[PDB]
Amino acid sequence: VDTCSLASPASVCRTKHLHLRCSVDFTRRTLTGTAALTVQSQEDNLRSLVLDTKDLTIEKVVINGQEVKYALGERQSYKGSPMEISLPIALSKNQEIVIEISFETSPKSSALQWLTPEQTSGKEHPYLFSQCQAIHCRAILPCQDTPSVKLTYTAEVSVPKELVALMSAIRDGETPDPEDPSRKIYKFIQKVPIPCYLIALVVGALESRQIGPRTLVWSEKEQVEKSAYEFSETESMLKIAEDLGGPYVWGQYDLLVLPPSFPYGGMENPCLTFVTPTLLAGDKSLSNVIAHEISHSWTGNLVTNKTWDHFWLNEGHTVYLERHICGRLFGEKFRHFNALGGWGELQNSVKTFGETHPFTKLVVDLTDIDPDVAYSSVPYEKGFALLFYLEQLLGGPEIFLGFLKAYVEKFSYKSITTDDWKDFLYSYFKDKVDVLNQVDWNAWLYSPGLPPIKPNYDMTLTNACIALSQRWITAKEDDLNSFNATDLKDLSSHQLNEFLAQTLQRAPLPLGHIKRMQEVYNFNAINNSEIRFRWLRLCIQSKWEDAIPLALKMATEQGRMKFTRPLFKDLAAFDKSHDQAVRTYQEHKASMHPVTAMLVGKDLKVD
Ligand SMILES: C[C@H](CS)C(=O)N1CCC[C@H]1C(=O)O
Ligand SMILES: [Yb+3]
Ligand SMILES: [Yb+3]
Ligand SMILES: [Yb+3]
Ligand SMILES: [Yb+3]
Numbered sequence: 001v002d003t004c005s006l007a008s009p010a011s012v013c014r015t016k017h018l019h020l021r022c023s024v025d026f027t028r029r030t031l032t033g034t035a036a037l038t039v040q041s042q043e044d045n046l047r048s049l050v051l052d053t054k055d056l057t058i059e060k061v062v063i064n065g066q067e068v069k070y071a072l073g074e075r076q077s078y079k080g081s082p083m084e085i086s087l088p089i090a091l092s093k094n095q096e097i098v099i100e101i102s103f104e105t106s107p108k109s110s111a112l113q114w115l116t117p118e119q120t121s122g123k124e125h126p127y128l129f130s131q132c133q134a135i136h137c138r139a140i141l142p143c144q145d146t147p148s149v150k151l152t153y154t155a156e157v158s159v160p161k162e163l164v165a166l167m168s169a170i171r172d173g174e175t176p177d178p179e180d181p182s183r184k185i186y187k188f189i190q191k192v193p194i195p196c197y198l199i200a201l202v203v204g205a206l207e208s209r210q211i212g213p214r215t216l217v218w219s220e221k222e223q224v225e226k227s228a229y230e231f232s233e234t235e236s237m238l239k240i241a242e243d244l245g246g247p248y249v250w251g252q253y254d255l256l257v258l259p260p261s262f263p264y265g266g267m268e269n270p271c272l273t274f275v276t277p278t279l280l281a282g283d284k285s286l287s288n289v290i291a292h293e294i295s296h297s298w299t300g301n302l303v304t305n306k307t308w309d310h311f312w313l314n315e316g317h318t319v320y321l322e323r324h325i326c327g328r329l330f331g332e333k334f335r336h337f338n339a340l341g342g343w344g345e346l347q348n349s350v351k352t353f354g355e356t357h358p359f360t361k362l363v364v365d366l367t368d369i370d371p372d373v374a375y376s377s378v379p380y381e382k383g384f385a386l387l388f389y390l391e392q393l394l395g396g397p398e399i400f401l402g403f404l405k406a407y408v409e410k411f412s413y414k415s416i417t418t419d420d421w422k423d424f425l426y427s428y429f430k431d432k433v434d435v436l437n438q439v440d441w442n443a444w445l446y447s448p449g450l451p452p453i454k455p456n457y458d459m460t461l462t463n464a465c466i467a468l469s470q471r472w473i474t475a476k477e478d479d480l481n482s483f484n485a486t487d488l489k490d491l492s493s494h495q496l497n498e499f500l501a502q503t504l505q506r507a508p509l510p511l512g513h514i515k516r517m518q519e520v521y522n523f524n525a526i527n528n529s530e531i532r533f534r535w536l537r538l539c540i541q542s543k544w545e546d547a548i549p550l551a552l553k554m555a556t557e558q559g560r561m562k563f564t565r566p567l568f569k570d571l572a573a574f575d576k577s578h579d580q581a582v583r584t585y586q587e588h589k590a591s592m593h594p595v596t597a598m599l600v601g602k603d604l605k606v607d
């Protein structure tokens with residue numbers, strides 16, 4: 001049961017292909033065009049079917065050259081409106097037909113953000129980008145909006161000629177629009193079957209630079225050079241990921257650096273990963289987000305969650321490969337460092353949600369829950385924690401890596417549940433069932449709170465972080481003079497980050513300690529977004545008013561939800577900044593990403 005979709009389920013019928021012809025109207029902020037769905041019946045005598053839509057205007061539905069009848073049901077809030085279509089002939093099992101739907105999106109589409117020129121880098125051209133995961137594809141085009149169905153797709157997209165269109169597919173040529181010489185048509189082909197959440201579109205003043213044999217980076221002109229250097233490890237990480245997961249099947253692996261309002265670190269669109277510009281630290285230090293996006297080329301994009309209830313499958317395996325890529329690159333001690341970090345993140349979200357909250361369960365029941373509201377680090381880190389525990393139980397990384405690659409090969413091109421995964425684990429490790437039977441499955445998969453067991457972590461790189469954070473916590477006023485810029489000389493950027501994460505977990509500290517920290521370590525100068533984030537949270541939670549313009553500025557100048565949401569919540573929890581926080585949210589709202597706007601609104605209780 002896909003409880004997030006209102007469409008006919010895969011048991012009734014399945015989309016096999018989408019042919020999208022559309023046009024991006026910046027003046028109206030709509031996409032207008034036709035989606036031709038090739039639909040296969042999975043039942044005898046099939047006479048109608050249902051698709052998901054959200055805020056779509058339907059002009060007509062044509063099958064076999066004639067218009068047919070359809071109806072739109074009433075709005076079911078965030079699930080949108082079900083669209084029922086009457087087929088002009090009854091279909092037998094496995095018969096196919098092509099349904100061509102003429103449609104137009106709302107300017108308020110939850111899939112889309114429309115940017116004026118002044119909201120971009122170059123200031124001369126507007127920009128558009130999509131984010132379909134989880135259930136926003138329906139807010140672009142009628143479809144069975146469920147990751148239980150995989151289709152191939154072709155598209156032709158008409159844009160103003162001075163702009164560039166890209167999708168989650170291979171570029172298949174461009175020509176002038178023959179109906180409007182002020183527009184170009186860009187063509188695309190996705191030959192590998194994908195869930196519709198993986199359909200993506202960007203349109204903007206984009207340039208490309210090549211950075212490895214099957215990778216171009218794309219961004220506006222002003223970001224190209226910085227991005228090319230920042231993501232230069234991409235091919236070596238692709239090679240390591242092929243070694244762990246088997247052949248990369250997607251042809252190209254290009255990267256697109258989005259504007260600052262992009263809501264996530266990354267989105268694994270096939271052929272074209274989207275990333276936040278907040279990765280551009282200048283030293284490649286945030287490149288684990290590229291390792292993660294690459295790993296999704298296997299776990300998520302080849303083997304996919306059957307419904308969003310089983311999202312941990314996508315994210316937990318991807319974090320598990322991500323941390324192996326970083327470990328082959330930087331050493332096993334560093335993999336442990338990141339894993340132990342991941343645990344503290346899990347501790348953080350459990351504490352923020354409460355230890356009985358349903359959203360701290362690994363497998364979540366999303367009946368009547370908007371997946372955007374349920375989204376957190378839990379499936380990433382509780383999922384990773386489960387895999388890391390099994391790895392240790394089952395005889396170490398080399399052994400558990402053979403399972404990962406077999407699992408990927410078993411379920412390639414399929415959509416699967418937690419039970420499918422577990423069955424295969426039991427079958428793969430048949431000779432270790434007795435070990436597998438010591439696992440508290442009910443607790444790990446279905447209980448809220450921290451898992452019932454904590455893995456074993458090497459401490460080598462973490463100890464210096466803990467040691468410095470503990471010095472600061474236990475320091476009294478007469479001890480502040482002992483801290484010095486030399487305390488940091490042997491810490492990597494990752495260790496500075498993790499010193500601040502440890503210290504943040506015991507926030508607030510006295511305001512005098514925080515001011516000293518700034519005096520001796522000058523964290524205010526650091527532009528690494530992860531480090532800056534945690535330091536500003538430390539400052540605001542410790543009630544340093546000087547930090548208020550700095551936190552508001554970071555919260556609004558980018559819109560990665562990982563940063564924007566905790567900053568606004570911290571700023572709203574501080575009496576001194578409460579009113580500016582609400583006011584700035586309100587003045588920025590209209591020009592925020594729509595999912596980000598909604599979430600920060602809920603977080604702040606505004607509207
Ligand atoms: C690296 C992943 C890609 S699925 C991501 O963007 N995350 C993971 C949880 C937070 C959020 C973020 O970094 O903004
Ligand atoms: Yb029949
Ligand atoms: Yb007509
Ligand atoms: Yb071609
Ligand atoms: Yb079994």
Ligand SMILES: [Yb+3]
Binds near residue numbers: 476478479
């Ligand atoms: Yb003392």
Ligand SMILES: [Zn+2]
Binds near residue numbers: 296
């Ligand atoms: Zn991911």
